[PDB]
Design a protein around this nucleic acid. Structure first.
Ligand SMILES: [Mg+2]
Lengths: 263, 123, 455, 82, 67, 95, 51, 573, 98, 115, 46
RNA sequence: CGGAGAGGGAACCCACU
């Protein structure tokens, strides 16, 4: 009638992704972890775009959308910021937003590529993902400019999570897999021989799927959390766990208050 | 069949031929509707084909029959012959914005003041 | 509100509804209600009328509400049925080998509105508690309903032989005391047919109870479909490659038979059928051979069909498709017809400039020996396009006649009604029938029955 | 016609049920005195439904026969369908 | 028009991969080698560049509205 | 001067005839635009091709319900003369 | 016989399995434009005043 | 034929036809003969040779064009007359070889059978694997799929202009698209579809979309609408563009006119909404009355650009184009390249959406119950070849009659990339995390977004504007009109037996009206309500007068009949 | 003015006989998609009366192989009457037979 | 124009309650828990943790409508045990599970970094 | 009051008052585009 | 100054179910 004891071991750690396995937990708990990974991990993305000039061939809302999809390096500032709906201030302050500026004009006859490098933040640590790639790769293109064309804009970056908009989704690919060999047979293969073996499967080439066990329960949940570049893949999981824990704590507080008010 | 056997045999044969096309598809239509159609098509002793040549000939009313393939010849004929429309149809009361005798309008509602004695108003 | 799809053909096209406010900007109606309206959700638009006076609001409430309009007086059948995912999922759910875990049973029962909060004793208590799909559909079925239906794949010899009341194939749906005892529920059980389970439910329990029955079926079955899943794929359309060889052999012998019939006709060795000329009897022989070949290839396709196939999982449930659709997808598209005959000689005594003159062979006159998987050779593609063009033209042309027929019928009978004398009279009180339907009985409250004392 | 000669059905048809309910709930909406003690419900249509179920609606129905005659059926006096 | 910033399905950043993809195609690299040289393992991300038509270049051939 | 004839785009006397893609872009025209349409009151107009029975050819038909069984028609036109299609029928009576 | 009517809306229909057969989903834009006339009574007078 | 094949005197378009059993030999030269090019076949061999193919492959340097190919006597233009008297072969390899002889007397061969298709039907992948009505519907809906319709769409001030943000050339394509330039101006996005029944919101031919993909820009588009106006028309009634000022101009809406500039127009880049003035135009009143153009109700866009110029009469002329982006919402009509149309039924976020072993969540989920009756096997083969192509790095080839690619080859190619050979995958439930018992068919398929958005069709009414002749509600979404309670809806209400509802629909909800009619003659009388003087001339009664409630259309029908000398007399007794 | 009126309105004839002259010619170019523009620029029309119960003109004829698209046609009351043009199908322009 | 705001999925209105508790009259020791502005993310874990308690006779969740933002959790427990205390024990056990998982995951990260 | 416009051809900002013929002071080109507005525009990145 | 909103119509064409 109590909680179970989960264990985690890391199978691969990289600036791009984290691959690991969680043991001795529930399928619902694992799915909710995978689900907070996509939905309820707050990051910093720009949500307020003011365009002072746009002579490009991509219109203003197109430019604003492409700007908003640009990830921003927010590893620790997202924890110390506040939601703009919760901050006591007016329109924007440094305590709940980050100002961005973009003033590019094409003057030479060569086509000018407006990239995320051209975005100048007010906070030096909250920047796009052009931070470090040494140990050649390009940067996120925004728009291309013809000679004489320009665009000037000022933007603010808010704190949000992927349930509002997909631009606050810190993860690119969250691989989820449990029971790679169909021992539980939660899925039914009409021809198991035609199905390729999973990466985490432990079977010889002779055998196609694990023998059925009626007593089995879903465990050994395999994750591969791939970061888009805003948060580190290792801290995405920590932030998701903290967010789920605080959400559960808030629900418990509301329930306790309601019960003590009903009694 | 009308020329050889008579109107009642016409009704049965018309029912059979009208059911043949519907049941040829395997679909079913209740006998209620086939009987009603074959009756209203043969309730006047002659073959009342459902056209402007059979529906407008019966003395239903100029207002009723000026809603179907008509509304000029019928109205001028009625004006010329001084015909009176009793307004007992449905498409006749519909034009004048009146309750058609069609259910919820086929009857009248009256107050039973004896049963009004009971009951009281509350704040 | 009263809510209709504009091409109103019958009184189950303008039906009352209760308004629920939903965020986005589209009308949303339940999927059983799709069938009466003839909706498709493929870009359909439906217009909604709000009764303004409270009198007419109450009138709509008491006359034209959709739960009250379940059974038509047109053919004394229910009009709404389980359709298009819920029907297939019910067929897959009420199978004999369907077992639900404790958590899954609780999740499904949470979607039952007419549930007493009492968990039934599972069909298996040990080694571990498992329920059955029929055991949950029994809770779904309201009140105490008793009906007996037969599944689509019910064999004929089963009733005559033994195992009559213990079905090996789990056919012969039997519902007793409001509880599904045995049988797999299909179109012929939960659809719009006469005497179906929903029809018995409407005739026994109230219209509101049958409304709740639709709601419970759809919610719980669509939520079990989250676990079960239902698809269709390119692998569902492939054969064993021995069935491919069988189909090729059937096609080849059919082509040889057509060729030898052509030879007999050319050498004047073919005797005309009495009542027919030589041309039409040759046409009859060719059509018989081609139709027999197509039927044999189709039957081979269904025999090769697997238990797990999604095409079969749809056609057996009757939600969508027919048994000839699988044949046209897998084995043979068929022979293309224009005005009932083979493809006519548009050119000079030939069909296309790729065929030799006076070529009566199956490939030269519209027969397509390829299926939708192997693709159509360009001649067959053109012939199939020309065949489907006929149906497309008919679809457009038929409307301007059928709607006119409907209007002309209505304008001849629009004032015929049942008076309080219980007789049937037109607008001028001329008696049409002394009793409605020459029995005085409503057409929506009758059933099909058998006269035992007859024969 | 007199009370002795009543040839119409003793069942309140669906059209009478709809129209009586509508025209009685309309009266309730215009603050007509209710014939049945209510338990706090405010919707005149539900009030009229409750009155119909309790057989207290102060309305009678005039059923016109085809010949021209009529019959006065009290709502309390004929059988309600539902 | 222009390459999307993120893959519609995955959400992996694809906006910075277009110019590098064209540069790799300006070599002996095939599309299948350029895509996984850029690190596109999932076909959801691969199609983002494989099926993209870059119409911004055709748009830039027109003189601007201002100067 | 007789008048001004509306002229089809990308035609042999249209101002966009034979121009290169760079020139078309300089003229704010689409190089991929196929042309073949008229600009009248600043609105693109496209002459839909109209079918008709071929001229100067003999057709023998047989209409079902008529006083004559077979009828042979040859609608005739000179080389784009002002006269319309002067159709002549040669027919045979049906007993 | 047929004519334009007030208090009528029209839009695209889309499926929704999570409501009963007697329910129909309508947008807030349509519901906020089409009106129903309620007669005031001492029962609903406070609710209608607040409305 | 010899002269026509060298273009000595007879040009290529001229067709020579020899009827053989009947001795006529006809030559046609007139205009309007429809014809297509065909290859020339001698004994059993084509005149097209490796040398022709080589010298034409190195084109743009040897300039050996199609005209030179025609001049070589390799191809001819054959119309229908000449097509009757000729023998064609579909494919030279398969139909010109030693075998059990069929013809052995061919005269022409087709270049490629896929050229029998048109323009909209040449974009269908695997069109011979579909039922023909599906192909017809796709050819019809290809004209409605939104995309970059032209490169110069920004200079093109045009009404009802639709462009998609991120068009993509299809992953699987026909070899005939490169000639339609479809890979340069495509209309659609290569979506990853999963043909599965997920929740039931796609049951009747509908579709689920990925909310996160839509947020990322999936099928997002912008709607261009242009507004034109010109000033002028009389001796003194001069039209002029200006800001209408309340004390000066008499007639004005409640709309705010501050958005206008003092010349009477809005500057581009200003947020606009329904019932907002765009062009302030006033006519002199013999003070002034405005004729300002209002933005179409419920548009709610942004002004893109404003152009001012002179028309051919030398008057000031203004056209204004307004941007309004259309984020894909539920109800928006989406379709594939196989006649599988459907409106979005629900939009789930990436978390709510099913997913593979990887994080791949389908952008689109369609009901599997749309395949078996429609029989769009081309759709399934497209969904398979799209995955094969997106994994291989190649662009898929879906030429109709290729015969070099089939389902078995595509499956074998797919099996090499670590996927099930038939395209099925094991998706996991997005809500519970349990893997779906059945395996889901999923892969990239080229879906199109059609112009039939729901925001352009939704409208309501509650006692809005009224027509002038008969006082019935107006017609049309733009005019805030009402729906037509037509003759069949009237019949349906009769069948329901809802007479009070029928009268409410046709009388109070459309045009309630009262008229006064004499009791002696059923003719309309004259009523002066304020003085309560009710007299019916022709009778001199003034005393017995009846008021009858009537539909205005009924009154106007009676007045028309009286104008036709008919006397409809309506006695209330 | 005659050319401009005829091409702008579609009434193919003198302005006095607006009802007599056949309409539908010179339609406004459909400029929603490039494929739509190409299809509208390659389109044929059969000037026979619509809403007619004679399906014979509407049917796809055998001589439509390679000159008229079999698939492409509107689904409304113009099935088979409005037909587009095949890809390599070319319409002769006429020359002197002398 | 009918599109609801994106923040509607998780933000309570003024006067709304995050949790609502209603006793179930059909069966004893049963209760319905209505949670506003939450979804499967919380409902599934709550249901799974409730199902581990042997004193819980019934536990399940549903979202009445995906367009709406609500979730209903019905809990039936054995007598002498309350559904409210069952729910709060499930929550306080799930929080402990998540905290332990956080500790173990960060330890695993630390030993994976050069270990 | 100023209402600066843009020539379509030479892209020259040229002053025009109210009720004047649409003319560019150079190049004689007769099609003018207005300007971009000065008021604030706020775009969500959604 | 009173919130003024009622804003022609005919024809043809395309398209949606
Ligand atoms: Mg439809």
């Amino acid at each position: 009638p109590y909680a179970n004891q989960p264990t985690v071991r890391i199978t691969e750690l990289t600036d791009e992704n984290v691959k690991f396995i969680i043991e001795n937990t529930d399928l619902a708990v694992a799915n909710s972890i995978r689900r907070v990974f996509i939905a309820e991990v707050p990051i910093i993305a720009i949500d307020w775009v003011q365009i002072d000039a746009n002579s490009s061939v991509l219109h203003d809302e197109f430019i604003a959308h492409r700007l908003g999809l640009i990830p921003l390096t927010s590893d620790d500032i997202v924890d110390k910021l506040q939601y703009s709906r919760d901050c006591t201030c007016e329109e924007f302050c440094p305590e709940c937003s980050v100002e961005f500026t973009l003033d590019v004009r094409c003057n030479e006859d060569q086509t000018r590529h407006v990239t995320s490098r051209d975005l100048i933040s007010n906070s030096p640590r909250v920047i796009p993902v052009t931070s470090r790639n040494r140990d050649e790769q390009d940067d996120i293109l925004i728009v291309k400019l013809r000679k004489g064309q320009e665009l000037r804009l000022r933007a603010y970056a808010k704190k949000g999570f992927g349930k509002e908009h997909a631009k606050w989704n810190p993860t690119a690919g969250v691989a989820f897999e449990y029971d790679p060999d169909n021992a539980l047979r939660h899925t039914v293969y009409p021809k198991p021989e035609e199905w390729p073996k999973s990466e985490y499967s432990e079977l010889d080439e002779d055998e196609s799927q694990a023998p059925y066990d009626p007593n089995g329960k879903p465990e050994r949940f395999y994750y591969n959390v791939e970061s888009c570049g805003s948060l580190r893949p290792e801290t995405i999981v920590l932030s998701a766990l903290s967010g789920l824990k605080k959400k559960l704590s808030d629900l418990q507080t509301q329930l306790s208050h309601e019960i003590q008010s009903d009694v | 069949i009308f020329t050889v056997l008579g109107i009642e045999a016409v009704r049965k044969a018309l029912e059979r031929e009208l059911y043949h096309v519907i049941s040829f598809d395997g679909s079913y239509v209740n006998y209620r509707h086939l009987a009603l159609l074959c009756d209203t098509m043969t309730c006047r002793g002659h073959l009342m084909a459902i056209t402007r040549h059979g529906v407008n000939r019966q003395d239903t009313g100029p207002l009723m029959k000026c809603s179907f393939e008509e509304t000029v010849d019928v109205l001028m004929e009625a004006a010329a012959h001084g015909e009176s429309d009793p307004m007992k149809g449905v498409s006749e009361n519909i034009m004048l914005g009146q309750l058609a005798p069609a259910g919820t309008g086929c009857f009248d509602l009256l107050l039973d003041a004896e049963k009004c004695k009971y009951g009281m108003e509350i704040p | 509100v009263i809510f209709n799809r504009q091409p109103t053909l019958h009184k189950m096209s303008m039906m009352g509804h209760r308004v629920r406010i939903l965020p986005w900007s589209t009308f949303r109606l339940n999927l059983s209600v799709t069938t009466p309206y003839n909706a498709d959700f493929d870009g359909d638009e439906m217009n909604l009328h709000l009764p303004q006076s409270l009198e007419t609001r109450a009138e709509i409430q008491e006359l034209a509400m959709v739960p009250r309009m379940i059974v038509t007086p047109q053919s004394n059948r229910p009009v709404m049925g389980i359709v298009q995912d819920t029907l297939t999922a019910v067929r897959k759910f009420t199978k004999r080998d369907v077992f639900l875990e404790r958590g899954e049973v609780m999740n499904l029962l949470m979607f039952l509105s007419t549930w007493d909060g009492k968990v039934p004793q599972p069909a298996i208590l040990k080694p571990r508690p498992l329920w059955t799909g029929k055991q949950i559909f029994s809770l779904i079925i309201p009140g105490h309903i008793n009906c007996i239906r037969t599944h689509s794949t019910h064999p004929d010899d089963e009733d005559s032989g033994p195992y009559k009341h213990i079905s090996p194939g789990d056919t012969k749906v039997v519902v007793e005391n409001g509880e599904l005892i045995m049988g797999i529920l299909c179109k012929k059980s939960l659809g719009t047919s006469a005497g179906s389970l929903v029809h018995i439910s409407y005739l026994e329990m109230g219209h509101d109870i049958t409304r709740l029955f639709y709601s419970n079926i759809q919610t719980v079955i669509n939520n079990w479909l989250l676990i079960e899943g239902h698809t269709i794929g390119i692998g569902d359309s492939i054969a064993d490659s021995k069935t491919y060889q069988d189909i090729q052999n059937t096609i080849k012998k059919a082509k040889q038979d057509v060729i030898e019939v052509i030879e007999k006709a050319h050498n004047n060795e073919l005797e005309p059928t009495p009542g027919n000329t030589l041309r039409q009897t040759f046409e009859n022989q060719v059509n018989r051979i081609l139709n027999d070949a197509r039927d044999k290839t189709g039957s081979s396709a269904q025999k090769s069909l697997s238990e797990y196939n999604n095409f079969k999982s749809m056609v057996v449930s009757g939600a969508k498709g027919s048994k000839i659709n699988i044949s046209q997808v897998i084995a043979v598209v068929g022979q293309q017809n224009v005005e009932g005959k083979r493809i006519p000689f548009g050119f000079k005594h030939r069909t296309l400039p790729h065929f030799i003159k006076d070529d009566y062979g199956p490939e030269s006159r519209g027969f397509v020996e390829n299926s939708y998987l192997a693709g159509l050779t360009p001649t067959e593609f053109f012939f199939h396009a020309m065949g489907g063009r006929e149906g497309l033209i008919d679809t457009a042309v038929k409307t301007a006649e059928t709607g006119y027929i409907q209007r002309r019928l209505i304008k001849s009978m629009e004032s015929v009604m049942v008076k309080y004398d219980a007789t049937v009279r037109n607008s001028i009180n001329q008696v049409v029938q002394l009793r409605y339907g020459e029995d005085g009985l409503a057409g929506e409250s009758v059933e099909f029955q058998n006269l035992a004392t007859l024969k | 016609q007199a009370n002795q000669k009543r040839i119409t059905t003793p069942y309140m048809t669906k059209y009478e049920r709809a129209r009586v309910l509508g025209t009685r709930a309309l009266q309730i909406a215009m603050c007509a005195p209710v014939m049945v003690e209510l338990e706090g419900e405010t919707d005149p249509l539900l009030i009229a439904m409750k009155e119909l179920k309790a057989r207290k609606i102060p309305i009678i129905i005039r059923r016109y026969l085809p010949d021209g005659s009529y019959e006065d059926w009290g709502v309390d006096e004929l059988i309600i369908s539902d | 028009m222009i390459i999307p910033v993120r893959c519609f399905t995955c959400g992996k950043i694809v906006g910075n991969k277009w110019e590098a993809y064209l540069g790799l195609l300006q070599a002996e690299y095939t599309e299948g080698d350029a895509l996984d040289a850029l690190g596109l393992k999932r076909y959801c991300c691969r199609r983002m560049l494989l099926a993209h038509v870059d119409l911004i270049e055709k748009l830039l051939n027109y003189a601007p509205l201002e100067k | 001067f007789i008048g001004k004839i509306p002229i089809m785009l990308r035609s042999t006397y249209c101002l966009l005839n034979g121009l290169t893609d760079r020139d078309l872009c300089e003229l704010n025209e689409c190089p991929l635009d196929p042309g073949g349409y008229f600009i009248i009151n600043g609105s693109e107009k496209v002459l839909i091709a109209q079918e008709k029975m071929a001229t100067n050819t003999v057709y023998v038909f047989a209409k079902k319900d008529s006083k004559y069984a077979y009828t042979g028609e040859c609608r005739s036109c000179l080389e784009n003369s002002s006269r319309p299609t002067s159709t002549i029928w040669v027919s045979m009576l049906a007993r | 016989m047929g004519k334009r009517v007030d208090f009528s809306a029209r839009t695209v229909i889309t499926p929704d399995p999570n409501l009963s057969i007697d329910q129909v989903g309508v947008p807030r834009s349509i519901a906020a434009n089409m009106t129903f006339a309620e007669i005031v009574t001492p029962f609903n007078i406070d609710r209608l005043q607040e409305l | 034929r010899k002269l026509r094949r060298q273009m000595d005197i007879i040009v290529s378009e001229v067709s020579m036809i020899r009827d053989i059993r009947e001795r006529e030999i006809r030559i046609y030269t007139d205009a309007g003969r429809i014809c297509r090019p065909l290859l020339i076949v001698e004994k059993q061999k084509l005149l097209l040779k490796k040398r022709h193919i080589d010298q034409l492959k190195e084109r743009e340097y040897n300039n050996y064009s199609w005209q030179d190919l025609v001049a070589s006597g390799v191809v001819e233009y054959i119309d229908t007359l000449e097509e009757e008297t000729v023998m064609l072969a579909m494919t030279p390899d398969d139909l010109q070889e030693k075998e059990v002889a069929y013809c052995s007397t061919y005269t022409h061969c087709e270049i490629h059978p896929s050229m029998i298709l048109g323009v909209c039907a040449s974009i269908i992948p695997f069109p011979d694997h579909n039922q023909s009505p599906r192909n017809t519907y796709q050819s019809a809906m290809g004209k409605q799929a939104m995309g970059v319709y032209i490169t110069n769409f920004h200079v093109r001030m045009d009404t009802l202009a639709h462009v998609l943000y991120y068009p993509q050339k299809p992953l699987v394509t026909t070899r005939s698209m490169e000639y339609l330039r479809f890979r340069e101006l495509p209309a659609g996005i290569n979506s990853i579809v999963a043909i599965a029944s997920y929740t039931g919101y796609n049951q009747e031919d509908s579709v689920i979309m990925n909310r996160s993909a839509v947020d990322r820009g999936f099928f997002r588009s912008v709607f261009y609408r242009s507004y034109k106006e010109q000033e002028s028309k009389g001796f003194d009634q001069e039209e002029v563009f200006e800001k209408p000022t309340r004390e000066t101009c008499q007639g004005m809406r409640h709309a705010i006119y501050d958005k206008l500039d003092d010349d009477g127009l809005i500057a581009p880049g200003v947020r606009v909404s329904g019932d907002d003035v765009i062009i302030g135009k006033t006519v002199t009143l013999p003070t002034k009355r405005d004729c300002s153009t209002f933005l179409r109700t419920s548009e709610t866009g942004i002004v893109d650009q404003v152009m001012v110029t002179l028309n051919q009469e030398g008057y000031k002329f203004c056209k204004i184009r307004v941007r309004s982006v259309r984020i894909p919402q539920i109800g928006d009509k989406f379709a594939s390249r196989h006649g599988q149309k459907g409106t979005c039924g629900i939009q789930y976020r990436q978390e709510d959406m099913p997913f593979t072993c990887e994080g791949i969540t389908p952008d689109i989920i369609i009901n599997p119950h749309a395949i078996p009756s429609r029989m769009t096997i081309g759709h399934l083969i497209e969904c398979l070849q799209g995955k094969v192509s997106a994994n291989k790095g190649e662009i898929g080839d879906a030429t109709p009659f290729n015969d070099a690619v089939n389902v078995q080859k595509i499956s074998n190619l797919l099996s090499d990339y670590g996927y099930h050979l038939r395209g099925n995958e094991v998706l996991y439930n997005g809500f519970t995390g349990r893997k779906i018992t059945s395996q889901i068919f999923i892969g990239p398929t080229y879906y199109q977004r059609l112009k039939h958005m729901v925001d352009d069709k939704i409208h309501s009414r509650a006692r809005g504007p009224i027509q002038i002749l008969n006082r019935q509600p107006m017609e049309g979404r733009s005019r805030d009109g009402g729906l037509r309670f037509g003759e069949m809806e009237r019949d349906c209400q009769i069948a329901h037996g809802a007479a009070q509802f029928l009268r409410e629909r046709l009388f109070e909800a459309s045009d309630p009206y009262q008229v006064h009619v004499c009791n002696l003659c059923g003719i309309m009388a004259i009523a002066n309500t304020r003085t309560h003087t009710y007299e019916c001339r022709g009778c001199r009664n003034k005393t017995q007068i009846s008021l009858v409630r009537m539909p205005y259309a009924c009154k106007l029908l009676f007045q028309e009949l009286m104008s036709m000398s008919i006397a409809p007399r309506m006695m209330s007794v | 003015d005659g050319l401009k009126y005829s091409l702008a309105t579609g009434n193919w004839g003198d302005q006095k006989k607006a009802h007599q002259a056949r309409a539908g010619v010179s339609q406004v170019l459909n400029r929603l998609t490039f494929a739509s523009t190409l299809s509208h620029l390659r389109r044929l029309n059969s000037p026979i009366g619509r809403d007619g119960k004679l399906a014979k003109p509407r049917q796809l004829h055998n001589t439509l192989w390679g000159m008229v698209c079999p698939a492409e046609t509107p689904e409304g009351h113009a099935v088979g009457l409005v037909k587009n043009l095949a890809l390599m199908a070319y319409i002769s322009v006429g020359s002197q037979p002398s | 124009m009918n599109a609801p705001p994106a923040f509607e999925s998780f933000l309570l209105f003024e006067g709304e309650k995050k949790i609502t508790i209603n006793k179930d009259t059909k069966v004893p020791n049963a209760c319905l828990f209505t949670i506003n502005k939450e979804d499967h993310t919380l409902g599934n874990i709550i249901k799974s943790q409730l199902l581990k308690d042997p004193q819980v006779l019934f536990a399940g969740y549903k979202v009445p409508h995906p367009l709406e933002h609500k979730i209903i959790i019905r809990v039936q427990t054995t007598p002498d045990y309350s559904p409210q205390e069952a729910f709060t024990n499930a929550i306080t056990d799930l929080i402990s599970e998540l905290s332990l998982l956080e500790e173990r995951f960060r330890v695993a990260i630390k030993d994976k970094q050069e270990g | 009051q100023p209402m600066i416009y843009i020539c379509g051809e030479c892209h020259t900002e040229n002053e025009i008052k109210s009720r004047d013929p649409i003319r560019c002071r150079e190049c004689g080109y007769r099609i003018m585009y207005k300007k971009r507005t000065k008021r604030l525009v706020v775009f969500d990145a959604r």
